[PDB]
Design a protein around this ligand. Structure first.
Ligand SMILES: [Mg+2]
Ligand SMILES: [Mg+2]
Ligand SMILES: [Mg+2]
Ligand SMILES: [Mg+2]
Ligand SMILES: [Mg+2]
Ligand SMILES: [Mg+2]
Length: 70
RNA sequence: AUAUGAAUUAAUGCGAAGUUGAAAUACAGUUACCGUAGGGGAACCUGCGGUGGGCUUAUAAAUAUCUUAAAUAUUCUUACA
């Protein structure tokens, strides 16, 4: 998982790298608590979750700004 | 009317090797050319207007701004929703 990391001793505080891994553990579990986001555009998803050609509407072409000519 | 000769006479073409000016073609060294006039043996020179087939070849008196910069965007592979 995370080789070549030397933990700290229980007496002494978290180190910077231990803090990083700790907040990663927080980020993957509890940071996303409270609400789910819906109907919001995320730029990366056009690249990794493009729709199928049959599912494209005029509205989604317009929201992408395809209609704006010179 | 028309043809044929004509003394004399005007122009023009060509050719051989040369000869003389420096007018044109470059800003051709006075922008060229068109028209017209005078001068000159002539090339050309000068006056007046016109044209560009010469100047469109045209190219700065200059100064620029504030919001969560990241445990948050940048990662992401049909996922979620
Ligand atoms: Mg000359
Ligand atoms: Mg001249
Ligand atoms: Mg004279
Ligand atoms: Mg005129
Ligand atoms: Mg000229
Ligand atoms: Mg010219």
């Amino acid at each position: 998982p995370y080789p070549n990391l030397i933990p700290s001793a229980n007496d002494k505080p978290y180190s910077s790298q231990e803090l990083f891994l700790r907040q990663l553990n927080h980020s993957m579990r509890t940071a996303k608590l409270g609400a789910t986001i819906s109907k919001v555009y995320y730029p990366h998803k056009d690249i990794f979750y493009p729709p199928l050609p049959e599912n494209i509407t005029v509205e989604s072409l317009m929201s992408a700004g395809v209609h704006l000519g010179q």
